[PDB]
Amino acid sequence: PIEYLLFEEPTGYAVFKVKLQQDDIGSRLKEVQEQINDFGAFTKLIELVSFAPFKGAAEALENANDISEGLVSESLKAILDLNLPKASSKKKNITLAISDKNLGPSIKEEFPYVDCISNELAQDLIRGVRLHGEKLFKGLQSGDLERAQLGLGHAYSRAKVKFSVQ
Amino acid sequence: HASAFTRTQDVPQTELQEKVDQVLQESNDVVAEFQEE
Amino acid sequence: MKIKTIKRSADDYVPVKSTQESQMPRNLNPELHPFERAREYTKALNATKLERMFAKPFVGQLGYGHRDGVYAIAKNYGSLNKLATGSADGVIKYWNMSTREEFVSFKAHYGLVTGLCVTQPRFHDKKPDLKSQNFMLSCSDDKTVKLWSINVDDYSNKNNEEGLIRTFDGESAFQGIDSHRENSTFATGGAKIHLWDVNRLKPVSDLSWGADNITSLKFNQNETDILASTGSDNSIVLYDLRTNSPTQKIVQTMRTNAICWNPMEAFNFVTANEDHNAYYYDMRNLSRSLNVFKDHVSAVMDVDFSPTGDEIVTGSYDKSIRIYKTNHGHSREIYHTKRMQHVFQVKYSMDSKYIISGSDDGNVRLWRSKAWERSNVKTTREKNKLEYDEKLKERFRHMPEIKRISRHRHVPQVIKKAQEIKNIELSSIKRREANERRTRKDMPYISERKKQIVGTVHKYE
Amino acid sequence: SKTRYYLEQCIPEMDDLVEKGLFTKNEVSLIMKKRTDFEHRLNSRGSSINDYIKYINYESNVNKLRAKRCKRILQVKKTNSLSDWSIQQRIGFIYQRGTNKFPQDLKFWAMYLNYMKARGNQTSYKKIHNIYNQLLKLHPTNVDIWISCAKYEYEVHANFKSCRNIFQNGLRFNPDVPKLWYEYVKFELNFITKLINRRKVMGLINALRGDIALTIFDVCMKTLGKHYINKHKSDSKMNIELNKETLNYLFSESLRYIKLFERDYLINHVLQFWKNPELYLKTVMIDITLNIR
Amino acid sequence: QTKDKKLRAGLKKIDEQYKKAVSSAAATDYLLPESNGYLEPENELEKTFKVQQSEIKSSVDVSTANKALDLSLKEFGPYHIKYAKNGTHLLITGRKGHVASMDWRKGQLRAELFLNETCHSATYLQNEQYFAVAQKKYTFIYDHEGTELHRLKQHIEARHLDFLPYHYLLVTAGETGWLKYHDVSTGQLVSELRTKAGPTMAMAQNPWNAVMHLGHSNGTVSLWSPSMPEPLVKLLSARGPVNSIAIDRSGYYMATTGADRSMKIWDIRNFKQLHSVESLPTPGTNVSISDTGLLALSRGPHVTLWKDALKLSGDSKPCFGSMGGNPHRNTPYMSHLFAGNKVENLGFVPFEDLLGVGHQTGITNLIVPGAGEANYDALELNPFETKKQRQEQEVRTLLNKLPADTITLDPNSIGSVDKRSGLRSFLRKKTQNVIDERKLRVQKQLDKEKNIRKRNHQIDVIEEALSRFG
């Protein structure tokens, strides 16, 4: 039960739907790690469902700062609101897989019907997604990921140091 | 299984939602051999 | 003079591109496909050879394990990764099988642990977190039942209270434990079994046929008010909860070390019995047994049903662990190692793919349920080929060559020699019974399923 | 393999089509040849939108030929067969595979939607809504597709509540689009005029109305100012210059709102909030021309 | 039908599954890609055996008319023609030394071998690559370039070698009266049988059964398998020697020609000869069967093709000329005759509609409208094969080769079910003998008790007075 998983990206958020689970007793195995490493075996597990890009670089910087501090952003709340199915708020909650235990409780507070997961298994899925990157986007447009990394890294670092034209 | 059409939580989440909602609330041979064999 | 000959559109048969994959026309005419039985037989033979070559049952073990031998195992029925193991030293551990590591390690008791169970209590003072914590229930030798929390990183929607929620002091030495599910009400079998509530320190009710001890218990899966108990006057007693009373007693010959209900029929259960046997009983007609499972050479120690409800895994006092199907009555497979000894507990896993087996050398080794089904997700072509080979081997199973190479499993020499000695002894007993049948007139033809029941109490007819 | 699976799915309607006397065996074989060609060209590597579109076009032509053949060779408008819905199901499945493989093609998404709306008699409200949910999940920042789904629902079903929620979600995703703000105000005034004309015909057989659009205008100007500040957010001169650029932006937009624009009262509220140099001269000339009107 | 509901339900379940399988087979028959070719006279005055190869070459496309070859290599003897099982490679072996293996469609000579030692016959064994020729004495396995891979020694004077591809088994019928099954994968003489009758004049394989048919000097054909050293069956077919035999692809009909101007059409699966063509002016040299049930006869300057001669009707017996156009007479479907050539052998092309005759000057492909079957199966044999696809299918066939002893008369016979120190050593021998005598004694006692039990199962005045005195 790992139904959806989130992935943050320098050009916005991506929400994937998991189709088949690797069995969680042999998750330490050579064969499951090798099928994570191979691309053609990953798409049987993960298909993209939504991908909302950031508007501008300043919005990207502020949203990255909010992810760093561990809070939820307006765009993130909008994406999850559009994507996740509203189930009953008492039993049978919808399972979202994320990467941060610190990000867990804010997601849970904003959506009482969702349940965050950051396991070794969820970290393995996010690791595979990060490894395969633009091949998983099926032709959907994105910026050059590495150029986005460089720009956002410099902007975030200048913000945390308070660099100055003086 | 939620969609973009219906409202999800039935509570205003933005200022747009709450303002328009409160104003609408105001507005209400061979043969022999073979035989041998 | 109207003629037409056979032309081939070469663009149809070989594509104009280079990346396009060519078509593969198929004509299923049996005149065109000649050797049905021979091709399918050799495909089954190559399938069994590849299976016997790819049989690799052992996958790993759970960390460093325990010190003095694993005597209690309790899987988590809700989740999939979590089990609890309990040594005879007194320490209980809560293994994450995913990472093959522990969560915590509670040095629990002074004496041995005699039972473990995992659960979630239904407190009336609050609703405890079903999600950030799990709960364990350890049933000791020195007259104590201790209920523990485990902080569990399953969900991340929070961010104290690590160990020993509650203790239940006792009067007799507790020996077995199980928990009535969906109601959080646990029964402990000591010298007389007590039904305990989680929120009551005193035992709520007493269940006792007679004043003899009880070795083990187990609730049934469906229709969850039915309990079954194994007592050391070699007797199986079914208990009931909604009438709050003992229900029916059957007295066998030798003591039944374990019992296990099956999760897909709700009134069948298998008993691991000390005369090398596993008896598969119905509930309502206890005057006979539905089946016998026969292939051990020492005392069967534990049994479990696969959650599909069709296979039984049995661990024995001999250092070996067998897997049976419900229909056959003989061992489908035997697992064994020089490093494992006296397998005292066996639990089939919860997704019906693996078999955890706790031996008494202090190691909890988990194995595969079939020695071929790899954990990786497989493409449709390979999955179809795999199911094809399995179905074909099933069809041609009983040919002599297929049977020889499918049954040739290597067994340790002590088990092999003990099995053949047992066969000599049985054949000699059989010929003596045959000579007695020749001489004497009135002897009963005892059935091999009704043989081992000394007597039932509620004699129905 | 998978192509064999799809052609075997194609078999039985062809069986019924040749069994009923409207297609001979040679025509059946030629159809199956073209089907094998299209299925292999789809399933192979390096396939393309051109291949999917050509497949759809050929199947539509085959359906039209079958319709003409059924109207001619036996003069029945609808046979009680399997094929008559089978070909349409095949086209729907082709569109499904195309949008599963290339989920970036706006033109293919639009072809799918126009096909389903055109045969919308036999289709489902729920099916169109599933298509729109899939597309809006994939491309959430396309005000064209947001406006398209809202306008479809408003002009076909006139579901005011659901179209309102559609616009609310679209504006939550894209605050930066004055075209989206413009179209939301357009829909709101169309709904108000529809309601007041409903009241007029009610009186025939036997204002908050502007204030909703006024509030939409107010929150529009606020968020547009914020987001054009965020785009190119530095000293007092740069602050003043970006302030004046944002002011020109918002006031050209409010001029477009006036061009969109009862009407006198709405323009009064617009110039009110505008008051809240040369632009001031533009305001007062708008005032004197309104007093002329 | 039995009156047990469990067996009724089980057999009905098996029956309905069988029905679903054959109906899906017919659905594939709808999915078939192509269609056969026909020849129709269209009138009453026009007869099908009046057409000519020039007329058909004019009336068909350029691809088949370019495929239908006519090679003339007059230097060496009457040539022998063998196609590969795919239908793409051709192999000719002259009578003196010429052996050529050619792709023949794209026009590439794979391997040319000049051998002064007089060759007789040769076959592509498992691909286009390896082919086996016969010589004056020995048999030779040859590689794809033309190099010598192996000199098969034991196959001495191999007259009629032939290969069978599911078992990977190379039959070599010779002259001393002998037949050697030789596995080519492991490289090992699997079976060696002696033919008691005489020099095996003709030979062909039943392909559905994969058994060997020899035709002896007596006038009998004989069916053999590499398991047991006697013939499975023997059929008196004609008198004198048997010149040639051919067997349908379905493995149902046999056509034999014998030197006393005789032709027999046999049913192999039921061993009753369907009929006997006796009106034969010259003795028939060769006889072949196509894949579409079409029969080919060669008298030496003449080749004749009959369509629908392989059934049980009285009209299905082929004749050579009808009086006034009798419909109940089987006129020859298509004829041809050469100038002064004696056709050495002939074989249909596998997946086109041609038959190649090899004769004294060379090679000729005669176009037939309905010779070969139209649409092949690509899992088994592909006329279009890339190199990786070919070698992969080769490894696959080598994996799923069938064992030699499986070759029997009924290819379903696998499925049947049945119920099937000094003093110590001396005294040990003593006690062992005593124990064995003890076992035999207790066996005799049990037998005596069972005999008396069988007896209990089956059950003078002075003698009555003296009754109980014994």
DSSP assignment of C192-217 equals SEEEEETT-SS--EEE-SSSS---EE
Angle at the Cα of E165 (from E164 to E170), degrees rounded to 5? 45
- B/e letters for E347-374, b = 16+ CB within 10 Å, e = fewer, are bbbbbbbbbbbbbbbbbbbbbbbbbbbb
CB contact under 8 A, B9 and A86: yes
Would you call C236 exposed, middle or buried from its count of C-beta atoms within 10 A (0-12, 13-18, 19+)?
Answer: buried
For the sheet with E188-194, list strands across it. Answer: E161-164, E169-173, E178-183, E188-194
Contacts of C20 in chain D (CB under 8 A): 40-41, 44-46
CB C267, CB C284: distance < 8 Å: yes
Q: Measured between CB atoms, does E33 come within 8 Å of chain D? A: yes
Of A56, A83, A138, the CB nearest to D137: A83
D3 CB contacts (<8 Å, ≥6 apart)?
A: C23, D36, D39, D40, D43
CB E241, CB E270: distance < 8 Å: no
Q: Measured between CB atoms, does D40 come within 8 Å of chain E? A: no
CB C62, CB C347: distance < 8 Å: no
Query: Tokens in use for A114?
Result: 């969702």
What determination technique applies here? cryo-EM
Give the separation between CA B3 and CA D137, rounded to whole angstroms: 9
H/E element holding C222?
A: none
Give the separation between CA C193 and CA C170, rounded to whole angstroms: 12
Angle at the Cα of E115 (from E112 to E121), degrees rounded to 5? 80
Closest CA to E38 of E356, E229, E294, E289: E294
CB contact under 8 A, B14 and D168: yes
Q: Please state, as a whole number, how many other Cβ atoms lie within 10 Å of the Cβ of residue C427.
A: 10
H/E element holding C384?
A: helix C380-395
Give the separation between CA E135 and CA E119, rounded to whole angstroms: 5
The label of the residue with tokens 């033979």 reads: C45
> DSSP H helical segments within A16-119, as ranges?
30-37, 57-69, 74-83, 104-110
> DSSP H helical segments within D44-142, as ranges?
49-73, 83-101, 106-118, 125-138
What's the first-to-final CA gap in chain B, in angstroms? 84
Residue D45 vs residues C17, C304, C424: alpha-carbon distances, Å: 11, 49, 66
Closest CA to A123 of A36, A60, A51, A41: A36
Query: Tokens in use for C166?
Result: 């509650």
Long-range CB pairs of A144-153, under 8 A, 24+ apart, other chains included? A145/A9, A145/A10, A145/A11, A148/A9, A148/A10, A148/A11, A148/A60, A149/A10, A151/A10, A151/A57, A152/A10, A152/A57, A152/A60, A152/A61, A152/A64
Q: Please state, as a whole number, how many other Cβ atoms lie within 10 Å of the Cβ of residue D192.
A: 17
Residue D256 vs residues D41, D185, D186, D193, D248: alpha-carbon distances, Å: 50, 12, 12, 20, 12
Phi then psi for C260, rounded to 5 degrees? -155, 125
Name beta bridge partners: A13: A8, A52
Closest CA to C324 of C337, C311, C338: C311
Query: Tokens in use for E289?
Result: 């069967």
Name beta bridge partners: C368: C354
Q: Measured between CB atoms, does C211 come within 8 Å of chain E? A: no
CB A117, CB A125: distance < 8 Å: no
Phi then psi for C246, rounded to 5 degrees? -65, 155
Residue D255 vs residues D186, D188, D240, D273, D285: alpha-carbon distances, Å: 15, 18, 22, 13, 12
Q: Please state, as a whole number, how many other Cβ atoms lie within 10 Å of the Cβ of residue C382.
A: 10
Q: Measured between CB atoms, does B32 come within 8 Å of chain E? A: no
Q: How far is C4 from chain E (nearest CA, A)?
A: 5
Closest CA to E91 of E366, E368, E356, E299: E356
Give the separation between CA E146 and CA E130, rounded to whole angstroms: 9
CB E403, CB E183: distance < 8 Å: no
E318 CB contacts (<8 Å, ≥6 apart)?
A: E277, E295, E306, E309, E330, E332
CB contact under 8 A, A86 and B2: yes
CB E138, CB E151: distance < 8 Å: yes
| Chain C: touching chains (3 or more CB pairs < 8 Å) | A, D, E
CB E334, CB E318: distance < 8 Å: no
Of D4, D33, D46, the CB nearest to C19: D46
Name beta bridge partners: C236: C230, C250
Question: What counts of helices (H) and strands (E) characterise chain A?
Answer: 6, 5
Give the separation between CA D253 and CA D222, rounded to whole angstroms: 12
Q: Work out whether the CA dihedral D216, D217, D222, D228 comes out positive or negative.
A: positive
Give the separation between CA E144 and CA E130, rounded to whole angstroms: 6
CB contact under 8 A, C26 and D3: no
CB contact under 8 A, E33 and D14: no
Q: Which among E195, E218, E237 is the top mutation candidate for probing chain B, defined by the most B β-carbons within 10 Å of its own β-carbon?
A: E218
Closest CA to C140 of C92, C174, C163, C166: C174
Give the strand pairing for A114-117 and A94-97: parallel
3-state SS of chain A: helix, strand, coil percent to 5? 45, 15, 40
Long-range CB pairs of C9-12, under 8 A, 24+ apart, other chains included? C12/D33, C12/D37, C12/E33
Query: Tokens in use for E135?
Result: 């010589």
Closest CA to D217 of D249, D159, D178, D262: D178
Q: Which amino acid is at E102?
A: M
Give the strand pairing for C364-368 and C354-358: antiparallel
Torsion of the alpha carbons at D141, D142, D146 and D148, rounded to the nearest 10: -170
Give the separation between CA C302 and CA C257, rounded to whole angstroms: 7
CB E162, CB E169: distance < 8 Å: no
DSSP state of C320: -
DSSP state of D130: H
Closest CA to E211 of E400, E81, E406, E414: E406
Residue E48 vs residues E41, E289, E331: alpha-carbon distances, Å: 6, 19, 9
- B/e letters for D102-120, b = 16+ CB within 10 Å, e = fewer, are bbebeebbebbbebbeeee
Query: Tokens in use for E169?
Result: 């088994």
Closest CA to E347 of E331, E363, E334: E363
Crossing angle, helix D263-275 and helix D236-260, to 10 degrees?
170
Contacts of D162 in chain B (CB under 8 A): 5-6
CB E342, CB E283: distance < 8 Å: no
* Chains A–B, number of C-beta pairs less than 8 Å apart: 13
> DSSP H helical segments within C342-379, as ranges?
none
| Closest alpha carbon within chain B to A81 | B8
CB E233, CB E214: distance < 8 Å: no
Q: What is the CA radius of gyration of chain C?
A: 27
The label of the residue with tokens 């072949």 reads: E288
Give the separation between CA C240 and CA C226, rounded to whole angstroms: 5
The three-class DSSP label of residue D182 is helix
Q: Chains B/A: 3 or more C-beta pairs closer than 8 A?
A: yes
Give the separation between CA E457 and CA E326, rounded to whole angstroms: 74
Name beta bridge partners: E182: E170, E189
Would you call E21 exposed, middle or buried from its count of C-beta atoms within 10 A (0-12, 13-18, 19+)?
Answer: exposed
Give the separation between CA C53 and CA D127, rounded to whole angstroms: 51
Residue A74 vs residues A63, A69, C310, D72, D173: alpha-carbon distances, Å: 8, 14, 52, 61, 9
Closest CA to C112 of C93, C91, C137: C91
The label of the residue with tokens 């594509």 reads: C15
Give the separation between CA E117 and CA E133, rounded to whole angstroms: 11
Half-sphere exposure of E328 (CA within 13 A, CB side): 2
CB D241, CB D248: distance < 8 Å: no
CB E261, CB E278: distance < 8 Å: yes
Contacts of D41 in chain C (CB under 8 A): 15, 20
The three-class DSSP label of residue A64 is helix
Give the separation between CA C5 and CA E63, rounded to whole angstroms: 11
Angle at the Cα of C331 (from C315 to C409), degrees rounded to 5? 100
Q: Please state, as a whole number, how many other Cβ atoms lie within 10 Å of the Cβ of residue E345.
A: 20
CB C365, CB C61: distance < 8 Å: yes
Closest CA to C366 of C107, C137, C87, C96: C96
Q: What is the CA radius of gyration of chain B?
A: 46
Backbone conformation region of residue D214, classed left if phi is above 0, alpha if psi is from -120 to 50, else beta:
alpha
Closest CA to E200 of E236, E161, E153, E233: E161
Closest CA to A22 of A94, A80, A97: A97
What's the first-to-final CA gap in chain C, in angstroms? 88
CB D66, CB D17: distance < 8 Å: yes
The three-class DSSP label of residue C40 is helix
Which 3-state string (H, E, C) describes chain E?
Answer: CCCCHHHHHHHHHHHHHHHHHHHHHHHHHHCCCCCCCEEECCCCCCCHHHCCHHHHHHHCCHHHHHHCCEEECCCCCCCEEEECCCCCCEEEECCCCEEEEECCCCCCEEEEEECCCCCCCEEECCCCCCEEEECCCCEEEECCCCCEEEEECCCCCCCCEEEECCCCEEEEECCCCEEEEEECCCCEEEEEEECCCCCCCEEEEECCCCEEEEECCCCEEEEECCCCCCCCEEEECCCCCEEEEEECCCCCEEEEEECCCEEEEEECCCCEEEEEECCCCCCCCEEEECCCCEEEEECCCEEEEEECCCCCCHHHCECCCCCCCCCCCECCCEEEECCCCCEEEEEECCCCCEEEEEECCEEEEEECCCCCCCCCCCCCCCCCCCHHHHHHHHHHHHHCCCCHHHCCCCCCHHHCCCCCCHHHHHHHHHHHHHHHHHHHHHHHHHHHHHHHHHHHHHCCHHHHHCCCCC
Query: Tokens in use for D154?
Result: 């408003």
CB C190, CB C175: distance < 8 Å: yes
C290 CB contacts (<8 Å, ≥6 apart)?
A: C268, C280, C281, C282, C449
Give the separation between CA C333 and CA C386, rounded to whole angstroms: 20
Contacts of D137 in chain A (CB under 8 A): 49-50, 82-83
